[PDB]
């Protein structure tokens, strides 16, 4: 049983013609869609190839097509005939020269012959072999395929979820190579798309609580996970939907080719699956093949040995009257549009034959140009050269495809795989009827029709257990699932350092809404703290008042001392209010010594005519020495005022000892003057009134302490001190007017 | 050509009989050691097997032995004859039924036939293939070997370095499967033994300056890595030593099976490679094989087709061609012209291993039957390989030391046991020769005392020295640390990272050194040396003055309305105040005592002010106590806010920190005393303006200078010095100032 027809080159064909019909236990069954249909597709291509005038003109291509019986072990023994021929060793059935093998539908079959043909360097193009193992070129060195591997569906399904802002996916793989290997790619693909997996459920051919269990393992755990990424086989997908039907589940299944566009998956229980998004392989039916295939007739098809057996099984009749098994075939029986439907993967079978033909055609030009036939160099073929140099780099457009200006580009990648073109289907309800409808293609980039896709909720569903969080809600704690954390509003006035964790450098004053704000305390001014105390200015008013008093003003001794004190008192308010300028408080303390010195001079007069000048210098010297002692080591700078997370102000020196130190010098002078005023009853006693006002000012000096604690409020003491200075000066001038 | 003899179940064999002889382009010669010798071993074993009675008695083993010609591609088409046995598809040499194949030789050959025979489920035992790739049971399922893979050498060599504490090593591999696939295993093995590679050369070319610079790379990069782990091929190992000889370097090479006991590697330039350590597979020569092989005769060995070709090539004659000689009849193989091949033990073991599995299967699948029953008419490779062949445990045949580690068994991957022989190049007087100094079966066992080294001493190859006593500041030279001393008396958490908390404070090197209170501020009169004498002198002066007032009264002097007693009482109280605070400085209340001392000094000054306010005695006495209360009220108010405490005395260095008091509080206390001193200063001016009173005026004027001097001394007293030298001196200065005030007060009473 073999289609061995002669030719300059001969191609090997491996098709599952018998659905374990030669297995001797599942015997008596041949495959129609995956068998003769795909087989005759290759023969159809070969007829076109050898009659084509632009692909191998002088080279007539024969075939050596064998049956794999859908069993890897049977294929291995069969495929040896491709090897037995291309080696160095009455006799009949002279061996051929298999240039390449176009065969292997079931990946288990296509793997066990990939191992064999690799050793003897025979290229192999395999339609319909989408297993991801075959992409491992370390083992299957000489394997190419016109169909994409099954892990490209993982990429497309991941892109579909990522497109719709979807996360928290629950995946339900299936036992076997298909479900398990495919979901590994999807699990890997979800990470790179920042898609997190709620549940990693798995199913098997059990038909037990497992199916009902798997349904609730997603309804119960994370009901926020509304999208379910199926990667199950065909029969498994139906039985899971049956399980979901009984419990009346409501999900938006994002399924793989195993579900596909088959209506038999949802035959019954459609509302539970309504809104699902399933993928299917992209394939444009070959128009010419139907004309060729429908014209087949056992009375004109003698190349195919299985065709006579196919005719019997197709129509359940007998070509010979000796059987009469329920019917005898008749001459008007034929293949027509009603009893036939083109297989989904006929496009890939034709491409596989053409890809081999194109590679052989190109190698015919390079190896020996200007040679219509095949040269003696062509008489020996090398697998490594034919595979990597030409076959693994061909770029011809697909034949028999009406839409040439489309994705009809036949080309193998660096792994010999397909290009990965899919059709994003979507189960839809028209109101009383359910039917699939293509809603998007996936060549390399997804392209959907969002406004024509029915969902299960009649609105675009979202699978979220945590909404995204912003510069508001900066932190991120993860109580349950790794992906949907709970964001926490960061302690106010903070520092972002990470999305997960967020600390606080400057929780008191002036950060940014980003990773920048940390104690960003711009300095204030001389009167910056009392910007809006409510009390602006008023320092020049004391100078104006002092100027008016000076304008109003025998007893030249009082004028000499009183005039200096009035001027110094006014300057204290300006220096105190408006780092170097922070030392003006020393002058104000020295000014009070002038009043004390005058009181001491007045006390001496009441109790050395030339000693008055020396006495003033002696008193002035002490004030200067004290200022130099303190202003020398400390001072000349300003100290900040960082409160308990209130704000940051770069004020003057926070050392209150300078005020206390200054008051000490005045206190001694004031204390001495008060003692003299006690005996000043013999105008007399006017100093006592001025001396008494100093005691109140001394008490007012105490309010400065514990008064500067209020920012911009302690400055009233400086204004009060200036006011106190005016009162003492007013007492001296008040007596004179009377 | 093949030895296709019949049998109940027949084995297959692949041997490199022809050194690419069929590939006449490469070399037409045939292998003798790896070829006929190994082949005849298989035939010798089969003759032994079928003549036994406790291993396949009724099952006569046959052979179908083919020549792999030492090329894998030629082996594949040859091995197909084994494959065609199990195919269900007018004359016909009918095929046999190959239970298993005993062959593979070169790993490249064995890999290709492993792929082919894996598909058709035929077990394969390789007597010589040792590539690490064949241990991957995912690709070569039905493959077993009686020799260990090549990565066990990497495991064995790494254990030699670990045993000898060598940690910083350089490696020099070759190009190809042997050099690469092994050295990567060694590099992985180095991690588990905490070993890092100084430099990893990959000199694999035939002969270029790559080896010359490779020796330089050994010299330049890490000269402190004296031992170098070679994993490179036999011919390459020869030229590397020659390169090392030219530069006249000196290392202690740790080689592999590539450079084993082959003296041809060091033929010439023995001294440069002297002291090396070389591994080599452990194989015991088969005594019975020598009698069989030497007794072979081209007139007796008609089974072997290549024997006539072997006879001609071995003896360089011809049996009939005009060769250099006609093959004489009395030529025979003897000990002079024959040395048993190293791997003959494994060839016999491989045949016996397959025969043992088939016998054990016969005892199970066909019990109570001396022949093979109907079940064995068809054999299943999967069951035979996975159950019987992969779990055999028979002791090696023809082994002299029975019961030793010479037991044939396959591990989970169908590999050999892994026995090696650690050799060492010796200096035997004036001659260099190899000698076994160890054996790595599965744990290293070395004759560590009888091994000669290049430097005549057990060498060490390290780029770092152990900095255990000090220098817990290792810098990671890569993988070897650079130890830096930790700063004097600083904290530590890890020898790798000294985190430098408190340098100069805590004197413990055991992961400490930061602030831990290493000093005490207590100083009993400067250790009773300086300043302590002044404390006792204060009491002596008071006793004389106290008695003097009573003696003068018993009044003889001016009555003064008891003013002298009030002034004397204040003077005594002030003098005792300074001594009391110093005597108890550890207590927290000592700071309060120092603060109260200033009030006593003001009290003595206050008494002078009351005395100065003489020009109403009862009113003056009451007024005097008012000043003390005013000073006491200020002290209580200011002291109440800080309360009782004893702050520390942190220092820039030396770790001199004493919890005595607050320096700022002392300055505040000193400033607080200034307020009382200010009143005393004001009193001095009043007294100056104003017989018996003349003496008081001089004392009051003198007291003013002492107060001014004391205040000036205090600001620079103990402020710029530590509590043991300057602060203690300042404390003594304060004590001296308090005593000096008593002297001024004493002068006034006189
Ligand atoms: N292309 C298939 C894919 C096949 C498959 C397709 C859909 C669902 C389940 C499923 O089972 C597996 C498991 C592992 C690898 C491949 C598959 C191939 O055999 O490679 C096969 C349909 C092609 C055909 O036989 O016509
Ligand atoms: N067993 C060997 C080992 C061989 C080898 C041995 C020593 C040095 C280099 C080297 O090159 C490689 C590289 C990869 C794998 C195996 C080897 C085989 O060829 O398999 C071959 C000696 C055995 C024989 O045929 O006598």
Chain centre to alpha carbon of residue B541: 74
Evaluate whether A151 touches A101 at the Cβ level (below 8 Å).
Answer: no
Q: How far apart are CA B42 and CA B28, in angstroms?
A: 24
Q: How many helices and strands, by DSSP H and E, does chain A display? A: 18, 17
Q: Report which of A398, A397, A374 is spatially closest to residue A386, judged by C-alpha positions.
A: A374
Residue in the structure block whose two tokens are 């339900």: A172
- A702 phi/psi in degrees, rounded to 5: -55, -40
For residue B38, report the distance from its CA to the centre of ligand 2, in Å.
Answer: 15
CB contact B615 to A (< 8 Å): no
Tokens representing B174 are 């070759």
SS3 sequence of B698-744: HHHHHHHHHHHHHHHHHHHCCCCCCCCCHHHHHHHHHHHHHHHHHHH
SS3 sequence of A399-442: CCCCCCCCCCECCCCCCCCCCCCEEEEEEEECCCCEEECCCEEE
Q: How far apart are CA A220 and CA A201, in angstroms?
A: 13
Chain centre to alpha carbon of residue A252: 23
Q: Report which of A10, A26, A9 is spatially closest to residue A18, judged by C-alpha positions.
A: A26
Alpha-carbon Rg for chain B in angstroms: 52
- A14 phi/psi in degrees, rounded to 5: -125, 110
Widest CA span of chain A, in angstroms?
Answer: 165
Q: How far apart are CA A435 and CA A429, in angstroms?
A: 6
Tokens representing A115 are 């191992």
Tokens representing A240 are 């899971």
Q: Which residues of B touch A668 (CB under 8 A)?
A: 678-679, 681-682
Task: Give the ranges where A295-339 is alpha helix by DSSP (H).
Answer: 306-315
- Contact call for B120 and A672, based on CB within 8 A: no
Print burial letters for B404-441: b (CB count within 10 Å at least 16), e (below 16).
Answer: eebebbbeeebbbbbbbbbbbbbeeeeebebeebbbbe
Evaluate whether A126 touches A143 at the Cβ level (below 8 Å).
Answer: yes
Is A405 exposed, middle or buried (CB count within 10 Å of its CB: 0-12, 13-18, 19+)?
A: exposed
Q: Report which of B313, B437, B433, B422 is spatially closest to residue B35, judged by C-alpha positions.
A: B313
CB contact B551 to A (< 8 Å): no
**Conformation bin of residue A56: beta by default, left when phi > 0, alpha when psi is -120 to 50:** left
- Residue A362, ligand 1, Cβ within 6 A: no
Q: Which residues of A touch B115 (CB under 8 A)?
A: 115, 118-119
Q: How far apart are CA A531 and CA B185, in angstroms?
A: 76
CB contact A115 to B (< 8 Å): yes
Angstrom resolution of this structure: 3.2
Evaluate whether A583 touches A600 at the Cβ level (below 8 Å).
Answer: no
Q: Report which of A304, A284, A310 is spatially closest to residue A44, judged by C-alpha positions.
A: A304
Kindly report the CA angle at A501 between A499 and A502, in degrees rounded to 5? 90
The tally of CA atoms less than 13 A away on the side-chain side of residue A444 is 4
Q: How far apart are CA B23 and CA B20, in angstroms?
A: 5
β pairing state of B98-103 and B482-483: unpaired
Q: Which residues of B touch A657 (CB under 8 A)?
A: 668, 671
Q: Report which of A134, A83, A98, A133 is spatially closest to residue B116, judged by C-alpha positions.
A: A83
**Beta-ladder partners of A67:** A15
Indicate the length of chain A as a whole number.
738
**Beta-ladder partners of A15:** A67
Q: Report which of A426, A437, A545 is spatially closest to residue A164, judged by C-alpha positions.
A: A426
Binding residues of A for L-glutamate: 38, 107, 128-130, 178, 257, 345
Evaluate whether A259 touches A232 at the Cβ level (below 8 Å).
Answer: yes
- Contact call for A661 and B671, based on CB within 8 A: yes
Provide residues with CB under 6 Å of ligand 2: B 34, 105-107, 128-131, 177-178, 233-234, 257-258, 343
Q: Report which of B371, B349, B347, B350 is spatially closest to residue B359, judged by C-alpha positions.
A: B371
Q: How far apart are CA A137 and CA A125, in angstroms?
A: 14
Distance from CA of A592 to the nearest CA of B (A): 17
- B353 phi/psi in degrees, rounded to 5: -60, -45
- The three-state secondary structure class of A253 is strand
Widest CA span of chain B, in angstroms?
Answer: 170
β pairing state of B9-15 and B98-103: parallel
The tally of CA atoms less than 13 A away on the side-chain side of residue A373 is 5
The residue whose CA has the least distance to atom 20 of ligand 1 is: A129
Q: What does the DSSP 8-state code read for residue B487?
A: P
Task: Give the ranges where B529-616 is alpha helix by DSSP (H).
Answer: 532-553, 563-583, 590-612
Evaluate whether B506 touches B500 at the Cβ level (below 8 Å).
Answer: no
Q: How far apart are CA A182 and CA A175, in angstroms?
A: 11
User: Which among B17, B72, B128 is the best mutation to test ligand 2's pocket, defined by most ligand atoms within 8 Å of the CB?
Assistant: B128
Q: Which residues of A touch B90 (CB under 8 A)?
A: 90
Which residue from B83, B118, B682 is facing A671, i.e. has the nearest CB? B682
Binding residues of B for L-glutamate: 38, 107, 128-130, 178, 257, 343
CB contact B118 to A (< 8 Å): yes
SS3 sequence of A58-75: CCCEEEEEEECCCCHHHH
The tally of CA atoms less than 13 A away on the side-chain side of residue B65 is 25
Distance from CA of B204 to the nearest CA of A (A): 24
Element (H, E) at A557: helix A556-577
Q: How far apart are CA B74 and CA B24, in angstroms?
A: 12
User: Please, what are the domains in chain B?
Assistant: 3-148+285-293+342-391 (3.40.50.2300), 151-280+421-446 (3.40.50.2300), 297-332 (no CATH), 525-747 (1.20.1070)
Print burial letters for B212-227: b (CB count within 10 Å at least 16), e (below 16).
Answer: bebbebbeeebeebbb
Evaluate whether A329 touches A311 at the Cβ level (below 8 Å).
Answer: yes
Q: Which residues of B touch A112 (CB under 8 A)?
A: 119
Distance from CA of A701 to the nearest CA of B (A): 16
Cβ under 8 Å to A: B residues 668-707 = 668, 671, 674-675, 678-679, 681-682, 685-686
Which residues lie below 8 Å from residue A229, measured CB to CB, with a gap of 6+?
Answer: A157, A161, A169, A170, A171, A172, A186, A253, A254, A255
Q: How far apart are CA B237 and CA B231, in angstroms?
A: 9
Q: How far apart are CA A185 and CA A177, in angstroms?
A: 12
Which residues lie below 8 Å from residue A446, measured CB to CB, with a gap of 6+?
Answer: A156, A159, A160, A163, A424, A440
- Contact call for A115 and B120, based on CB within 8 A: no
Element (H, E) at A624: helix A611-632
- Contact call for A672 and B685, based on CB within 8 A: yes
For residue A38, report the distance from its CA to the centre of ligand 1, in Å.
Answer: 15
């Amino acid at each position: 049983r073999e289609i061995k027809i002669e030719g300059d080159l001969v191609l090997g064909g491996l098709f599952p013609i018998n659905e374990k019909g030669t297995g001797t236990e599942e015997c008596g069954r041949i495959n129609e869609d995956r068998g003769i249909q795909r087989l005759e597709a290759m023969l159809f291509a070969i007829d076109e190839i050898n009659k084509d005038n632009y692909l191998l003109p002088g080279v007539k291509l024969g075939v050596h097509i064998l049956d794999t019986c859908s069993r890897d072990t049977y294929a291995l023994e069969q495929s040896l005939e491709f090897v037995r021929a291309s080696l160095t060793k009455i006799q009949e059935n002279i061996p051929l020269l298999i240039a390449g093998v176009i065969g292997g539908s079931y990946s288990s079959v296509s793997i066990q012959v990939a191992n064999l043909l690799r050793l003897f360097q025979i290229p192999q193009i395999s339609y319909a072999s989408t297993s991801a193992k075959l992409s491992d070129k370390s083992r299957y060195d000489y394997f190419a395929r016109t169909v994409p591997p099954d892990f490209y569906q993982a990429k497309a399904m991941a892109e579909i979820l990522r497109f719709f802002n979807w996360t928290y996916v629950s995946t339900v793989a299936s036992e076997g190579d298909y479900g398990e290997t495919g979901i590994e790619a999807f699990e890997q693909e979800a990470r790179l798309r920042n898609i997190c997996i709620a549940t990693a459920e798995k199913v098997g051919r059990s038909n037990i609580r497992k199916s009902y269990d798997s349904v609730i393992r997603e309804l119960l755990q994370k009901p926020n996970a509304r999208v379910v990424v199926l990667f199950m086989r065909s029969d498994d997908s139906r039985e899971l939907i049956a399980a979901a039907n009984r419990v009346n589940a409501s999900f938006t299944w994002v399924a793989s080719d195993g579900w596909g566009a088959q209506e038999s998956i949802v035959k019954g229980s459609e509302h539970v699956a309504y809104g699902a998004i399933t993928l299917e392989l992209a394939s444009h039916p070959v128009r010419q093949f139907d004309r060729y295939f429908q014209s087949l007739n056992p009375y004109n098809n003698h190349r195919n040995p299985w065709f006579r057996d196919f005719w019997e099984q197709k129509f359940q009749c007998s070509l010979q009257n000796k059987r009469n098994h329920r019917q005898v075939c008749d001459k008007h029986l034929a293949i027509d549009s009603s009893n036939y439907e083109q297989e989904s993967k006929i496009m890939f079978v034709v491409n596989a034959v053409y890809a081999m033909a194109h590679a052989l055609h190109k190698m015919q030009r390079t190896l020996c140009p200007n040679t219509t036939k095949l040269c003696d160099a062509m008489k020996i073929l090398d697998g490594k050269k034919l595979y990597k140099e030409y076959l693994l780099k061909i770029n011809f457009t697909a034949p028999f495809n009406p839409n040439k200006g489309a994705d009809s580009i036949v080309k193998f990648d660096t792994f010999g795989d397909g290009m990965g073109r899919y059709n994003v289907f979507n189960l839809q309800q028209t109101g009383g009827k359910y039917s699939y409808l293509k809603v998007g293609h996936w060549a390399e980039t997804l392209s959907l029709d969002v406004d024509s896709i029915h969902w299960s909720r009649n609105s675009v569903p979202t699978s979220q257990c945590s909404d995204p969080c912003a510069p508001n809600e900066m932190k991120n704690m993860q109580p349950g699932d790794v992906c949907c954390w709970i964001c926490i509003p960061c302690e106010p006035y903070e520092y972002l350092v990470d999305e997960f964790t967020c600390m606080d450098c400057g929780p008191g004053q002036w950060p940014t809404a980003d990773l920048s704000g940390c104690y960003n305390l711009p300095e204030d001014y001389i009167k910056w703290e009392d910007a809006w105390a409510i009390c602006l200015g008023f320092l020049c008013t004391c100078i104006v008042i002092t100027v008016f008093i000076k304008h109003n003003n025998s007893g030249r001794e009082l004028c000499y001392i009183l005039l200096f004190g009035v001027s110094l008192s006014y300057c204290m308010t300006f220096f105190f209010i408006a780092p170097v300028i922070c030392a003006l408080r020393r002058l104000g303390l020295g000014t009070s010594f002038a009043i004390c010195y005058s009181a001491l001079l007045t006390k001496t007069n009441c109790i050395s005519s030339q000693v008055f000048i020396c006495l003033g210098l002696i008193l002035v010297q002490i004030v200067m020495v004290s200022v130099w002692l303190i202003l020398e080591t400390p001072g000349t700078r300003r100290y900040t005022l960082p409160e308990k997370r209130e704000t940051v102000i770069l004020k003057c020196n926070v050392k209150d000892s300078s005020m206390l130190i200054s008051l000490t010098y005045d206190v001694v002078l004031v204390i001495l003057c008060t003692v003299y005023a006690f005996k000043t009853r013999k105008e007399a006693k006017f100093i006592g009134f001025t001396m008494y006002t100093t005691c109140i000012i001394w008490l007012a000096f105490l309010p400065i302490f514990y008064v500067t604690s209020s920012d911009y409020r302690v400055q009233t003491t400086t204004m009060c001190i200036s006011v106190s200075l005016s009162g003492f000066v007013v007492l001296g001038c008040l007596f004179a007017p009377k």
